[PDB]
Structure 1
Amino acid sequence: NQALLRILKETEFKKIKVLGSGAFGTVYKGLWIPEGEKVKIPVAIKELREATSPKANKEILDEAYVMASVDNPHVCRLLGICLTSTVQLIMQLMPFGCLLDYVREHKDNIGSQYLLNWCVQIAKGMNYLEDRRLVHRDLAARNVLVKTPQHVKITDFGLAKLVPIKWMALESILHRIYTHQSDVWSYGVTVWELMTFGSKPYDGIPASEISSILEKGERLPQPPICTIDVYMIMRKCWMIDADSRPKFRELIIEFSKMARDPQRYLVIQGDERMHLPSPTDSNFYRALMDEEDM
């Protein structure tokens, strides 16, 4: 339990390059230098923007231990932490980056089999979090990391103590209610991001006005590639009654069914000239970059 989170010294790692920032901190590509060794191991470091105290660090560590305890192929695990004035968190470096930027950059080369399997994998990761009784609270295409093109993992979950209005359920925007069913709403928006190849939700609508349009029944529009089958699932994630939305267990089953006949459910120009990697290319990826069980 306690051994799943490594406490690092300042002197055993170095930030080398800025990767981006968001709302809670700046993420760096970094290097871990094991004591007494000559190797340099790449890591990802998030330095929280707000400085904290030793007593606030007790809060940080209590949540850090929980996020260091996850064990699922599609959920990222927090690996380490270094406390000072500013808190630095350490996890595995994902060279492919986040799924949002990945789909924007590869939008003319992503076929139906990839998109639906990513939907399955995110639902598998979310179902694990629900099983562990951990609410994500910030699910979005930007918080799905690409380990390999065939394998995505959820990150930045459970930040209860630390707003993405356009990804939040109506009950979260108004009354600050965060449940696994409000995550299902965020899952719907994330799927919309993938199927629009990285479009911005409610583009040009100020965040302060999102709750009004949701109450009047407006929802994100049907993406051009989505059949009605897929759009019905997205819409059901955005029902105003949280208990009427699908469960992550059901989303796994439904998207897995569609993944077994992907061109029936997504209409993409060029779909027959793109496929999943052959077993050869998957074995090569996994041996070099992805040796975990699944």
Structure 2
Amino acid sequence: DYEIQRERIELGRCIGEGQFGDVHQGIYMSPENPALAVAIKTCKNCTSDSVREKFLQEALTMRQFDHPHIVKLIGVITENPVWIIMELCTLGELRSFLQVRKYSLDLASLILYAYQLSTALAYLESKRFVHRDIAARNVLVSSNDCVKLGDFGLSRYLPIKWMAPESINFRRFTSASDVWMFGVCMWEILMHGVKPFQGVKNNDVIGRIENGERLPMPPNCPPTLYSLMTKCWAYDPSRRPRFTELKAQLSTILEEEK
């Protein structure tokens, strides 16, 4: 079912670098589509079954989900060299896309990306699934008006500057900690792909959060949208909103502002 014939895949150019190897773009010639554009995650040292098991674990998680704003798993090739076939997001990483398009993208498009992300996260919340790594780096751009959530293997597991205080202090990951992370991610989107807490040491971050310090309101930001992020950044997890509420709030923001 998930096992794909290698001869149906035609490997193309290297589009990125991953945890286990190089990510490539390619073509999948199935009975349906003459040439579907795909992304091929490769694995360098996958002759070792321990590495193999770790690499293939992403595909095991991936098959459970089906959502328009989550990267779709097309298949796997378990014979060496081991490959993971995923739907291609041609425009690449969100961080990079936002940096490049800083003086072209409107606020309506920025709010749209957050909305789309909040729909994927609400779907994951419905499946009682905890992502553990919501960041602009783990978001892919399919088109000018479509973003997807990727990275379900936990590449950086340390993103201290995105983590909720209880994750830093006690390694507690819940639906509430995912909300905090989404808050930081909405800040990064409005900050046009700028990393949070620049020139601040990781060990000094928790000290600041505990003292009530937060990320400033971006220059191009509706105060109503910043009001929403500050709700995600409540110290007490039980006080943070859920993704069904954030989804609904971003809908009104999308309309009222632009």
Quick check: 2:224–2:253 contact (8 Å CA) kept in 1? no
Residue aligning to 1:200: 195
Query: Secondary structure in 1 aligned to 2:193?
Result: coil
Residue aligning to 1:104: 99
Q: Give 1:246 shift.
A: 1.2
Task: Give RMSD over aligned pairs.
Answer: 2.8
Q: Which amino acid aligns with 2:40?
A: I
State how far apart, in whole Å, the 2-side matches of 1:86 and 1:154 are. Answer: 26
Q: Give 1:164 shift.
A: 2.1
Quick check: 2:57–2:153 contact (8 Å CA) kept in 1? no
Q: Give 1:31 shift.
A: 3.0
State how far apart, in whole Å, the 1-side matches of 2:5 and 2:140 are. Answer: 26
Work out which of the residue numbers 245, 250, 258 in structure 2 matches 1:250.
245
Query: Secondary structure in 1 aligned to 2:151?
Result: coil
Q: Give 1:84 shift.
A: 4.8
Residue aligning to 1:150: 145
State how far apart, in whole Å, the 1-side matches of 2:54 and 2:18 are. Answer: 21
Compare 65-74 and 84-93 and name the one that shifted more.
84-93
Q: Which amino acid aligns with 2:3?
A: I
Work out which of the residue numbers 206, 211, 228 in structure 2 matches 1:211.
206
Q: Give 1:83 shift.
A: 2.7
State how far apart, in whole Å, the 2-side matches of 1:246 and 1:235 are. Answer: 10
Residue aligning to 1:122: 117
Q: String of CA shifts for 1:199-257, please: whole Å, max 9, x gaps.
A: 11111223343223222222211101113221121122122211211111110111100
Residue aligning to 1:274: none
Query: Secondary structure in 2 aligned to 1:79?
Result: strand
Residue aligning to 2:17: 21
State how far apart, in whole Å, the 1-side matches of 2:159 and 2:219 are. Answer: 25
Compute the TM-score of the two structures, normalised by the length of structure 2: 0.87
Q: Which amino acid aligns with 1:112?
A: L
Quick check: 1:80–1:91 contact (8 Å CA) kept in 2? yes
Matched, 1:240 2:223: no
1:130-145 equivalent positions in 2, closer than 5 A: 130-145=125-140
Q: Give 1:52 shift.
A: 6.3
Residue aligning to 1:180: 175
What percentage of residue pairs aligned between the two structures are identical? 37
Q: Give 1:158 shift.
A: 6.0
Residue aligning to 1:226: 221
Instruction: Give ranges in structure 2 of 5+ residues lacking alignment.
Output: none
Residue aligning to 1:8: 4
Q: Which amino acid aligns with 1:79?
A: I
Residue aligning to 1:272: none
Q: Which amino acid aligns with 1:138?
A: D
Residue aligning to 1:278: none
Matched, 1:262 2:254: no
Instruction: Give ranges in structure 1 of 5+ residues lacking alignment.
Output: 264-294
Distance 1:158-1:182 versus aligned 2 partners, 3 A rule = farther
